[PDB]
Amino acid sequence: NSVPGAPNRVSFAKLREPLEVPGLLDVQTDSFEWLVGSDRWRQAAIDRGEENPVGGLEEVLAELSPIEDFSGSMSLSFSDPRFDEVKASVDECKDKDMTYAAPLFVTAEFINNNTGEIKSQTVFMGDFPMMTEKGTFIINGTERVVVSQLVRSPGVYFDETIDKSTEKTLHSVKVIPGRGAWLEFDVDKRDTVGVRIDRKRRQPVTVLLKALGWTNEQIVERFGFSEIMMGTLEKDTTSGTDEALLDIYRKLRPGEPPTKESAQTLLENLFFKEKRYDLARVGRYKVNKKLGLNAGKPITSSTLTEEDVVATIEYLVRLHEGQTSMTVPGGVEVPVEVDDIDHFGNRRLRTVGELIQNQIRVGLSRMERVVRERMTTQDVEAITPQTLINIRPVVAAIKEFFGTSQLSQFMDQNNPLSGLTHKRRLSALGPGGLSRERAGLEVRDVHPSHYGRMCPIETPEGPNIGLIGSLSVYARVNPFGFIETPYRKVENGVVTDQIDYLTADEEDRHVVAQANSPTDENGRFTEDRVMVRKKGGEVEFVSADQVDYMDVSPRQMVSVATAMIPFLEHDDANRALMGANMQRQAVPLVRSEAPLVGTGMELRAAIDAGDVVVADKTGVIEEVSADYITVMADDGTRQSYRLRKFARSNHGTCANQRPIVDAGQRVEAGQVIADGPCTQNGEMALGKNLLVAIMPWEGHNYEDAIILSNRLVEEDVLTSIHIEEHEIDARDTKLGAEEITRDIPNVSDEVLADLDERGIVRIGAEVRDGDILVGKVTPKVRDTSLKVPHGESGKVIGIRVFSREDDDELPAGVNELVRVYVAQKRKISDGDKLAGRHGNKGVIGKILPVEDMPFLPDGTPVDIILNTHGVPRRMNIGQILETHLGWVAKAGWNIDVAAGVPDWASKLPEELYSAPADSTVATPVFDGAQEGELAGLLGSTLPNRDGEVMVDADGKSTLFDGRSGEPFPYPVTVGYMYILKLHHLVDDKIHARSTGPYSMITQQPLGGKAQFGGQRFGEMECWAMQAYGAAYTLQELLTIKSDDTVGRVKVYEAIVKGENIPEPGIPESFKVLLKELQSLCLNVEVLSSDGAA
């Protein structure tokens, strides 16, 4: 369990989970703790067996130092990065628009080498943004998240292709570093080995070898085993090292004069000197692993080396000849094979810590040049470490990252699940990555290496399809950035409790069995054949003694949002994807209600999302209030927790927190103390349990439209609160300052009634569309007040004000700023979208009075009607199964055991033999209720209040028509389904226009939700109009309604005057085109059918 306050949700699961779901936010917090070199991370690393681990900032400072004068007379070094406590709390930063940050300090040592003098000094490096306990950054009071970036790891990559000109098989290899020139080798269609250096022209590969100091005797000794290498050597017009170097230099430096020193040093600076070329630690690791070099030695350098180049060449030659095994002098034997680019053995996660580290590196590079200059422009006596350093480039780089980087994104605060998934999001598109414009299907496709590491279901459906995914629930990040997943060890056909986290490259070398495989006492497989996954991404029945590993859980492959879909395996992949996506866009409701049919994942997902308030240490409640809760621990110390009340989310949804504990209650460490926006008793609640009947109904649910009972509107079952935020700032101009004031010119006395003395609308005022919010005037004075936009309305819920007289820290040219918050409560209405967890989205087409809904013989009217014709074609019968189980969850059940356990119930745990009404159940996604169990439970449901069994064993009921009153001639499937209110509400999805603002540089209308823009008329619509032959309507659309100014004023006044719309004469476009043509000395003439005119 590991959650003291967990409600008792009985589970249908048969298999036990030998591993608990890890911290779902660890992907963010562990990476950031690595970046700042936290003590916890260091202890964890040395526990893992890492040798003297070094933090992210330490790495960059060790790379930066020592900074030295080019004369060698002085040195500057940086050490000991540490952080002071944060300036302000997270909520204070949110309130006052500050960044949540900690001062960073580094010990700087300056040395004068000519004298040998020492100076050491503590240098302030700037305020460094800090991650919150929730895995987010508060930047200018806005809560943001940094998404992990999927990128190809540096290393040596071999490839095989077909020569279209000859159909011959050609091989090639690319050495790809973190920074530096590229180095390619290839065997072409004429059986000769060549090299491309820095993407310049191709050369015989020996030209490089000679340039590196190899004589013909050495090349023959090393590569003599292959005839193509000897043919390349014997057909090369290069005598030795100097000639080869000069030939390389010519291609590398076209048009420049070649000399010995220039070429000799240039070839070294390309690949073998650190300041201009380096494989990252991961790149060195990958190269050593593939080429079998430096095995049994610590990774301590970044450059390419002579042995790497020679081994790459030999590997390419061996691969070309079809060999499978290769061992090099001083190395170890390794397989010979091409590399799949999309395999997570080659892709890696550039997480938050590394993303911040790179920008720190850039800023420190700028500061390094600053030091190089002002160290050589001052008296050696006066120079000190603090007077050599300018921190501004570093702070500017960090601010640039957190304010402009595509990977730094406003957190999706629609609901807790959306934020939790956003923190765990993996993005292949971004700086240094790929783009939506030209990313092919190859990178988008699911890969067999994704198993247990990246979710195959939860991905966007638009142009980001396949490019954005989610980390699997059991996956963690290898310190080199590779995703690794846990497996139970298996030996001699008996499973054992040792858990090993394997990367995809490691896993390909093993046989992994299916977790659901049966095992008897002490772990031996019952059956002699087992499903296993194999390196080809294949599945096979191997002998039970042929298994090396087993999956730890059936759902090892799914993400958090996918794990929350009951009966997942009964739903098609597309509809499961739709349901997972829709769960993230479900809006919070005024009252949250946990699903009757759920998974085991709701509780941990809600807890790890962090919207719920959790007690830090065991104690007893001292105080409870709508605003705060106070606890006294067994230590005797006291804690106070503050609840967010009616706070606006980034998306406008309400973030209200509520206390659940009573005064004097025992509260254990980790127990939930306050519910979040979409949680009930700690577990997530994104929707409502509705009584659903599966039938067509008078065509009002045609084509997936939904029929709702008016009860849901009356009882606010699906009501939600939304808060809008409006800004207005008083500034200054050349003609003077601007005033926020109640004394607006020429406005009626009542229109400014609700405004206060400063001119800001009072709290609690009901503001209509177009009404005043904040009065402001500016010189010319003019009316420039803030007014409620088109369609918007609500109650003024809050006011925030900033003035430079209070040191508000606003930008230049602003004297005051006012934010007005307007709260609106929206009931479910026609046109609003609803959806289940199975992708069964729909639009509410009709809301019926309670007496019109079809009702059960008990008298209960159904809440929702879903059309039959959707289920069979869309292949998501999991919604039907849930519905059945939903009823079995609302009405209790009791399996008779007097004579014995029924056969169908023989796999039920004794705790599931009976349960009372309204008892919640768990049916995990790949280990839950089977068909026979569900049918038996349907047969075993308790009767209703009056002693009547309302739903038969098949899940159907004899509904009555609420209008005519007679029963329907056949029983209808009835049950309980969990329904989500989606954020696609009608209130802002509707647009209308009849003239208005217009574009100026060209005179066509505007386009925008809040800008009163018109609809676009594309060329396809013009094609349709031409096909109709409706010439006059097309002319109206083309000229009067879009471009014409005079035509518009004339037609509007004609409509207003109630007179005939003038029939258009000479087009306005034609007259400008004619003069444009004439200006180029072209005689353009209008011709009549009878002659020139």
Binding site: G1065, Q1078, S1079, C1081, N1083, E1085, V1086, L1087, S1088, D1090
Partner: protein, 96 residues
């Protein structure tokens, strides 16, 4: 008369066509007046050539209201007419 807009013909314009299109020769390289933002006389924005910027407003002010149409002012050559003519009236430059 768009009811007789049946064909559109294109061809080389000769110097006489260019002189027939134009209302007057642009003599000076002047822009809008830097001193007062009025058009320069004989400039690229000259009102005597391309018409008045403001409706029925004579350059020298001897005719200034709507009732007057078509009249050339004897003192500055501007035609008292609707301002839209500045979108249609063509000029020309005589090359040496």
């Amino acid at each position: 008369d768009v009811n007789f807009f049946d064909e559109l013909r294109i061809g080389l314009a000769t110097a006489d066509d260019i002189r027939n299109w134009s209302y007057g020769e642009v003599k000076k390289p002047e822009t809008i007046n830097y001193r007062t933002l009025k058009p320069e006389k004989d400039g690229l924005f000259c009102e005597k050539i391309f018409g008045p910027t403001r409706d029925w407003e004579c350059y020298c002010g001897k005719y200034k209201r709507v009732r007057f149409k078509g009249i050339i002012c004897e003192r500055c050559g501007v035609e008292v007419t609707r301002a839209k003519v500045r979108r249609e009236r063509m000029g020309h430059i005589e090359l040496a």
